[PDB]
Design a protein around this ligand. Structure first.
Ligand SMILES: Nc1ncnc2c1ncn2[C@@H]1O[C@H](COP(=O)(O)OP(=O)(O)O)[C@@H](O)[C@H]1O
Ligand SMILES: Nc1ncnc2c1ncn2[C@@H]1O[C@H](COP(=O)(O)OP(=O)(O)O)[C@@H](O)[C@H]1O
Ligand SMILES: Nc1ncnc2c1ncn2[C@@H]1O[C@H](COP(=O)(O)OP(=O)(O)O)[C@@H](O)[C@H]1O
Ligand SMILES: Nc1ncnc2c1ncn2[C@@H]1O[C@H](COP(=O)(O)OP(=O)(O)O)[C@@H](O)[C@H]1O
Lengths: 77, 77, 441, 438, 437, 459
């Protein structure tokens, strides 16, 4: 039906009725994420978790694009 | 067979089908650049990049019958 | 055409009365069993009520006493409304996923959601199509159609002309333009333009024009289970998984959120929950790791009623080593409620053989039916029900019409009943491989 | 409103001074266990808990899981409650010491408040201002309104096929957009276009509502490990590229604790520690009571209510030691063990009355004594499963209330386990053609 | 704030004298286990020296005596410099990698590589992009203090184009590599737009000088270097877990290059501590690898705990002391522990009281000491919280004899639960049959 | 960037640090107290014969067993052989519990370790033009083609190394490199000889300040030659050839750019591939280019291999290209792990045991433990008096060998904490009660640990 496939049966389509799917998308993929460059820049200076990121041939933008695309789009990159 | 699709009678279902099951970003990334894009990239004053930098389709490993199943009699027989 | 006569193609329902719940002794195929069919009638009438949880009814009984028969009667006496799901209990031991989760999906497959919403469709024969592709493109065009009553002209958008050259709508097709999406399902071809079709077969069906108005609203009713929604909301395009079994361990937060949105759909009146039936055939083939999950999946609001069938007596439980009645642990036998069956009296054997003979349309003399009842007293229903199909063919060897004693006595001569096969094994020990020895004459 | 096996459990039914009272809130008797579970509920709400274990003894038929659902409805919808059986810990994609930590991270809750500013309405114009920023007029049935868009939300509008007069649904905060349909004023532009013609919304254009909404930390773990749902389009192949559960290392959890503590220190989110109810803990083997003895000692661990009904049994996975409850004494000293005693014959009748007035099945007092007779002499789970079939044998025979005769018929239509065992042994004597196959 | 009072919260280091190694009794949380704490202090002093490679130290003893307490004391009294690894033994039995490799990675985590360097980074807020379509350009960046105009030539204009940097972003350039990392937008431009996108996060302006140079001390492990060199974009594998049987030739190249870095003075090797909790869960197929991995130069000083007496070894069928094979017990050294006197039990309950900020009358403390002597530590420590909570229900400040007796009446110790099980055997599912009354 | 620390470049003490070789004569007769060993004469003589067999290239699939009890020196002889052979001959010390995988069958990790144990030395040449580009100046042809514009016959490149610069005339079909790779003035390149297609390494360091922000890698000038005609020895194990032929490393498509992007999975290798690689390596040896060098596969703890592995080892040892298999077994009459039927010697099946040259290993005399203590003490640097040596030897004879070599580190720590420099009898007599052996631990475990109760163990 058009309820499940379009309106609010999908947990990813952020239509009205699926009021969770906007909030959950933003606060799991851009605010409370450990790969956003703001949440990397504060943890790069010693024993902490992104210590190694200075030495692998990447940058913050390399890591941030690499942690949200697919295996496909990362292969195209 | 073609893959199974969803018969849902909204416009959004048709748009999501033609954006997932076809998804022109992957098709452009797989087959290569438009010849118009080749012309605007090869007559310009400065070198510019291409988003499929070459045709990313893998070379088929069987010369006479590639990526299909449609064969024909053989003048040999 | 895919209606080949099986071992249960004669059961057309449970056969009991629906007013005083009396098991009338011969109706709709199920003949003879009385007390068990009344208890199955009570269970069936509390399934369609809906105001009960997932409970457990165990159809225990000896082999070939009509347990799959009662389950198939309850399956036929519900129609395609309340979801009945068969589960032979060896489909659970998979390798694509774990075992408890494979059981959870079989619980989720039997809780339907039934929603009813409308569409707008168009019947009718196409009189003619004109498309203004002149270098032009799909920009404007005229569509003239008709029913027996109506006749109309419509103008078309660009994303409709691209669906008209997509389905290649001729002058004479019987199409169904679903207006809300744009798909075109050609119901057939009109008879009156039979000359106008050259690229068709010599044998081609032709319809008549559709009758009635040309623009009508349909109230279609869909019913999908919770496992359907779970597999849909699991990947990018994930419904293919439930057609290919490639679904894996579905995370439990998805099932929790769908259990929340189904309740929010019910409270808004947009939906309706239909509890189905799950038939776990041969429930003794589960280890205790299964029963320690069925004891708690039969607790929630969303749980289908489980009907299950056991053959074994005092037997061992798989996984463990200690024996138990019916092959089930005692803390799980506290949950279930047991219906016991009985072996069959010989007149009931005779009329069951009569129903199985009338189902395959095989003529029998009454002497051959008496001999066949005498065989079925000593070898069970399955042996005689196969001797029927053998004896029809043996009568068709020598070009006869009705089977007789001279063909049942040949079918009893060639194909051994299993008692004489056990006697054959016991009297041919030294050549049949028992465990160690092979002797060659 | 459909009846389950624990519909009549509403709460623990305590006093103001933490003393249980008999026949309160659905329970009948069972005083000390309800007092102890009330102390457990107060410990969960006190927020001074970084891993406590509570075991529930008592055999089958007693009310162990009724206490757990009483706790789950005593906490409310706010504090998360994760009930899992023991047998769910086994998978074929991850180790079984990782599904335990997935349940611990489903137990802890993180509540965020949002003020969603939604925009329903018909697009009036699509005007690119700079050469970038693109104004959109959203016409409602109450008035249009200008709206300035970021140059990244416009590339989410543009991926959707919004052209001139499509009604849309823009989230202002989260930037989520959906094309609802084409407005019915532009309906009959052509005559067989294929869109979903919907009317203009007869409300505001700017609806401002606030939503409190929860997130479990396991959802943070999954959303930070692998890309989920939105842009994960290669998962439609299925074989190797599906979202298979992967071994979430300790480093990822140790960083997600840092990020969540950062967003708690800004006063954005709130933290709520949850409850993990592991039922039938004998199915947990010794390769998980080793890992629980470590994982409960974290400063973040939630409370674990274990339930176990067995006596001195064999611990699974190590066949050469017996222990009480199926729990190793290495782990059993941690647990607070609560007893659960059986039921007296004068405390079964009240359960029959409450279970009868839960299902709506009314019956005379001469039948309550018979159901209590079957409750004493056989079992408690069986006598409560004759109230629903006998009502079916009541309204069919032209009655409304259940008498003794309907239950005397249902005891013959619906045999228990004990009489079925007696028929299975004594009546099914010889193993032959018409006998059971042991 | 994701930090709640667990069982191991009062132990702030090992608590011994650092000069002469004298375990004074009540220091830094730990109480009265003088010989084992002295031995752990000797172990810790040969850990921080870091010369002697690959010992093995087993900590035997009865349960509820303090074997993980001394381990957490050694973990706290090292600092963030020397690594430490809390691995219970059931973590090894995985379904994606074998036992040998998942136990090799436990050794590869506990050896750090320490390297000090200078980070030449540039924070800044973009003011105006000035592109001269003649190749050249000018970038204007500001902070809260300064503002500057830097030239650009050919290609980072194209990097700006690929990054789509607008006026108002917060860009960061690592000038030793040269790649733009857009950090988001500023709060000074939140007033500008109205309907924001998804990707935009707001930040404060950068503060201070543009060109920031700072000497930072990086410390990675060998496991980090092993997993990063596994596959191409393999750095996210150590957060995800999507790695498997790494080949031996990669680990050989990595150990050779770490030896080469130690020769050239770039790197300093810091050996650490692997802590294998509850080592009796390992089968013989794991001890046969531990007996070889304690031979190389790159092996951490392994500290392991155990509970069991003469028990069977998993995987085989013969009894042994401590659940360990004897060819492994010829290799380790063993520090035995001892049960506690009541004089130590009283002040351990006092420390658990002052950790949970629960006030106790002395009569309640003596009663709780008697309960701890009759039932153990883990039950006595679980009655402080319950008595505090029952005192909170009847609104009393100090807990008393009545609340502790109430908590003892409600919840059962494991000594009485066995008598409760053996008292009623006909209803608990023993192995075969249940009565169900 | 990375700041160099000027500290002491010492090393760490392992259990086999003091072993430096076998310590033989020029005739093969062993000599006691030489190169780390103490005693153990016949085993060192037999291992010297094994070392001679390996360096003589006559071993083609032999097998050597090391018997003897635990803590007697089998792994010591293994590391002695590995340090005696050197570094240019391979040595792959796997264990028995390292063939069990979850991606491949366990009779395949054995074959991959055989291929790790075999080396191949290849001697070749390297002819490259090298350095930073100074000019890219074309030259007009003598006869231009009619119908076109420019016609360029020879392209000139000025390459400047860090020692000397050189002008270079090239064929004009270097242009397709230069346009595709974007080579400009100030970019170090290398031009090969077999094809001749230059590939840019990076912008030079002298032009690191012409701009300000536009940065990439700034590689320095190649501090070497401008025309390398340098020869290369190159060691590749046959495992590396099997992997590079089975799973190709670098491709240009989507799916091989997902294969190196997804995790590399060990896959089983078909035997036709190994047969072909052997047939071609034995051809390149006959041409006289590559040298085959067999190594040692020291399978430590050989009683962990079950009966399904020795069956594959019989096939693998009958191959014409195979290294030596030095097993290491320390069991007597043991049950073989696979088939729980036959109690065989050493955990080795009796069919496989006939292939093996069994070398014994004897226990140590009670006057050689003190010499091992002296060598281990002067290895760590821990010096100690003679009565302390006699007490450690007393603990070594009466308890264990591995236990008297572990009372040296806590004694040294307590010595330099108490305020001394050398270890006396008091420090060892104090450290003997902080670190109990297995014997007194089992005594406490049985005597004090009576039964499972409150203050008792969990049996
Ligand atoms: N009441 C009945 N009416 C008609 N056929 C029956 C009846 N009971 C049993 N049968 C027949 O007997 C056969 C055995 O029944 P079934 O339930 O399959 O045995 P089992 O319980 O061993 O599976 C079935 O093929 C069915 O056709
Ligand atoms: N105090 C009580 N009041 C009412 N019903 C109870 C009570 N205790 C138990 N029950 C009943 O017991 C049943 C649940 O038994 P359960 O606790 O699941 O046993 P177990 O935990 O051993 O599986 C429920 O049907 C519930 O009606
Ligand atoms: N010396 C001590 N002083 C204070 N508290 C202690 C001491 N020893 C043990 N404890 C406490 O006793 C508890 C049990 O110690 P633990 O090592 O967990 O026992 P087990 O070795 O049985 O796991 C720990 O929570 C610890 O806080
Ligand atoms: N001949 C020897 N000379 C010096 N040290 C020895 C000798 N033999 C054995 N050792 C020492 O004994 C210790 C244990 O011997 P080990 O090699 O572990 O025996 P196994 O080979 O049976 O495992 C090693 O650390 C080694 O240093």
């Amino acid at each position: 039906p058009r309820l499940i496939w379009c309106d609010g049966g999908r947990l990813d389509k952020p239509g009205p009725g699926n009021l969770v799917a906007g909030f959950r998308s933003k606060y799991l993929n851009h605010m409370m994420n450990i790969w956003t460059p703001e949440n990397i820049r504060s943890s790069l200076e010693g024993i902490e978790n992104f210590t190694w990121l200075r030495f692998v041939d990447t940058s913050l933008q390399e890591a941030y694009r690499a942690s949200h695309t697919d295996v496909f789009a990362r292969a195209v990159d | 067979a073609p893959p199974i699709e969803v018969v849902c009678d909204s416009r959004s279902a048709v748009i999501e089908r033609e954006n997932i099951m076809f998804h022109p970003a992957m098709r452009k990334a797989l087959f290569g650049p438009t010849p118009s894009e080749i012309k605007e990239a090869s007559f310009g004053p400065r070198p510019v990049t291409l988003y499929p930098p070459r045709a990313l389709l893998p070379a088929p490993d069987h010369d006479k019958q590639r990526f299909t199943n449609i064969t024909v009699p053989s003048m040999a027989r | 055409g895919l209606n080949l006569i099986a071992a249960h193609s004669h059961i057309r329902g449970l056969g009991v009365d629906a007013d005083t719940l009396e098991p009338r002794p011969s109706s709709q195929g199920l003949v003879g069993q009385e007390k068990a069919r009344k208890a199955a009638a009570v269970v069936l009438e509390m399934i369609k009520q809906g105001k009960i949880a997932g409970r457990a009814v165990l159809i225990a009984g000896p082999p070939s006493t009509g347990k799959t028969a009662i389950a198939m009667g309850m399956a036929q006496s519900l129609g395609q409304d309340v979801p009945f799901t068969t589960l032979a209990a060896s489909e659970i031991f998979s390798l694509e996923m774990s075992k408890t989760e494979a059981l959870t999906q079989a619980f989720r497959k039997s809780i339907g959601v039934r929603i009813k919403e409308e569409s707008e469709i168009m019947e009718g024969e196409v009189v003619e199509i004109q498309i203004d592709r002149s270098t032009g493109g799909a920009k404007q065009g005229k569509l003239t159609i008709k029913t027996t009553d109506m006749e109309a002209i419509y103008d078309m958008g660009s994303k409709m002309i691209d669906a008209m050259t997509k389905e290649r709508v001729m002058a004479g097709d019987i199409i169904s333009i679903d207006k809300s999406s744009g798909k075109i399902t050609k119901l057939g071809r009109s008879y009156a333009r039979s000359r106008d079709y050259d690229a068709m077969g010599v044998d081609t069906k032709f319809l008549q024009c559709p009758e009635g108005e040309l623009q009508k609203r349909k109230e279609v009713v869909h019913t999908v289970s919770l496992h359907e929604i779970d597999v849909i909301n699991s990947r990018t395009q994930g419904f293919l998984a439930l057609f290919s079994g490639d679904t894996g361990e579905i995370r439990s937060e998805i099932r929790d959120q769908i259990n929340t949105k189904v309740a929010e759909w019910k409270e808004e009146g947009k939906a309706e929950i239909v509890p189905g039936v799950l038939f776990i055939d041969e429930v003794h083939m589960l280890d205790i790791e299964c029963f320690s999950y069925i004891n708690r999946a039969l607790e929630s609001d969303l749980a289908p009623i489980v009907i299950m069938a056991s053959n074994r007596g005092v037997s061992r439980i798989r996984g463990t080593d200690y024996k138990s009645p019916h092959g089930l642990p005692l803390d799980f036998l506290d949950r279930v409620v047991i219906i016991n069956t009985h072996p069959y009296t010989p007149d009931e054997l005779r009329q069951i053989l009569s129903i199985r003979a009338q189902e395959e349309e095989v003529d029998l003399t009454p002497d051959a039916l008496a001999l066949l009842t005498k065989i079925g007293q000593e070898a069970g229903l399955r042996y005689a029900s196969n001797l029927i199909t053998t004896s029809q063919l043996i009568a068709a060897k020598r070009r006869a019409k009705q089977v007789g004693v001279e063909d049942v006595q040949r079918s009893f001569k060639l194909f051994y009943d299993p008692a004489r096969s056990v006697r054959f094994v016991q009297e041919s020990e030294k050549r049949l491989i028992g465990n160690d020895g092979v002797v060659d004459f | 409103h459909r009846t389950a096996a624990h519909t009549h459990i509403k709460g623990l039914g305590l006093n103001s001074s933490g003393i249980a009272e008999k026949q309160a809130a659905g329970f009948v008797g069972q005083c000390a266990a309800r007092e102890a579970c009330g102390v457990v509920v107060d410990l969960i709400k006190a927020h001074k808990m970084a891993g406590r274990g509570v075991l529930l003894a008592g055999g089958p038929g007693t009310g162990k899981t009724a206490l757990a659902l009483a706790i789950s409805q005593e906490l409310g919808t706010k504090i998360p409650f994760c009930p899992i059986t023991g047998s769910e810990i086994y998978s074929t994609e991850v180790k079984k010491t990782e599904v335990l930590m997935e349940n611990f991270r489903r137990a802890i809750g993180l509540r965020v408040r949002e003020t969603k500013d939604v925009y329903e309405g018909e697009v009036t114009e699509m005007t690119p201002e700079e050469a970038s920023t693109l104004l959109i007029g959203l016409k409602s049935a109450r008035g249009q309104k200008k709206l300035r868009l970021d140059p990244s939300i416009y590339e989410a509008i543009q991926k959707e096929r919004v052209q001139v007069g499509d009604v849309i649904y823009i989230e202002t905060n989260t930037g989520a957009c959906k094309r609802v349909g084409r407005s019915d004023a532009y309906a009959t532009e052509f005559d067989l276009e294929a869109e979903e013609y919907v009317p203009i919304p007869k409300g505001e254009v700017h609806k401002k509502k606030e939503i409190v909404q929860d997130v479990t930390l396991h959802d943070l773990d999954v959303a930070n490990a692998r890309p989920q749902g939105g842009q994960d389009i290669i998962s439609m192949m299925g074989q190797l590229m599906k979202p298979k559960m992967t071994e979430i290392t300790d480093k990822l959890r140790m960083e997600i604790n840092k990020v969540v503590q950062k967003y708690i220190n800004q006063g954005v989110a709130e933290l709520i520690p949850g409850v993990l109810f592991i039922d039938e803990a004998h199915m947990l083997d010794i390769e998980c009571f080793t890992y629980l003895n470590k994982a409960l000692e974290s400063p973040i661990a939630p409370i674990v209510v274990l339930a176990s009904n067995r006596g001195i049994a064999t611990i699974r996975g190590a066949d050469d030691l017996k222990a009480a409850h199926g729990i190793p004494p290495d782990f059993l000293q941690r647990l607070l063990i609560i007893p659960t005693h059986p039921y007296e014959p004068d405390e079964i009748r009240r359960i029959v009355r409450i279970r009868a007035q839960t299902e709506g099945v009314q019956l005379t007092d001469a039948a309550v004594d018979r159901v209590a007779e079957h409750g004493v002499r056989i079992s408690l789970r069986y006598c409560l499963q004759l109230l629903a079939p006998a009502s079916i044998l009541a309204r069919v025979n032209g009655r409304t209330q259940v008498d003794v005769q309907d239950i005397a018929e249902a005891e013959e239509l619906f045999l228990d386990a004990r009489r079925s065992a007696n028929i299975l042994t004594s009546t099914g004597e010889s193993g032959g053609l018409h006998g059971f196959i042991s």
